[PDB]
């Protein structure tokens, strides 16, 4: 398993941005925003919650000051719609998808 | 266009996942799209 730091903020319909740590520790029922392979944004419920125990965490800081704090193998979407480990996006100097909500 | 500038190790921490159906991804603050 690969996973995100407590403080990583997920956008919810009901509550706005909430740390994933709160969502999982309290098993908060909520609705998040997802993107399909054509770039359409839609909303859907959180279906499951998992505490993944203790793992190595890295902080990745973008040119715009934004931060991603996660396990290095956790996958994120690139501009061209691939799902790749954040550490690989860093090492290969790839472009993260950025949706404006 | 907006690269990851730096990587810093923060040690071992208690970490988390959520799961959704359909495309198995969700939006974060600042517009990133994370996998389940």
UniProtKB/TrEMBL annotation, chain A:
Residues 3-99 form the Hint domain. This is DNA polymerase III, alpha subunit. It comes from Nostoc punctiforme (strain ATCC 29133 / PCC 73102). The lineage of its organism: Bacteria, Bacillati, Cyanobacteriota, Cyanophyceae, Nostocales. The chain holds residues 775 to 873 of 876 of the full protein.
UniProtKB/TrEMBL annotation, chain B:
Ca(2+) binds at residue 17. It comes from the Bacteria. This is Nucleic acid binding, OB-fold, tRNA/helicase-type. It comes from Nostoc punctiforme (strain ATCC 29133 / PCC 73102). The chain holds residues 1 to 36 of 450 of the full protein.
């Amino acid at each position: 398993h690969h996973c995100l730091s407590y403080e990583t903020e997920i956008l919810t319909v009901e509550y706005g941005l909430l740390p994933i740590g709160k969502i999982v520790e309290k098993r908060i029922e909520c609705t998040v925003y997802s993107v399909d392979n054509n770039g359409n944004i839609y909303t859907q419920p959180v279906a499951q919650w998992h505490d993944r125990g203790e793992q190595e965490v890295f902080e990745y800081c973008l040119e715009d000051g934004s931060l991603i704090r996660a396990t290095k193998d956790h996958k994120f979407m690139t501009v061209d719609g691939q799902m790749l480990p954040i550490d690989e996006i860093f090492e290969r100097e790839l472009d993260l998808m950025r949706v404006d909500n | 266009m907006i690269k990851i500038a730096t990587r810093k190790y923060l040690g071992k921490q208690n970490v988390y996942d959520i799961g959704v159906e359909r495309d198995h991804n969700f939006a974060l603050k600042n517009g990133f799209i994370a996998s389940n």
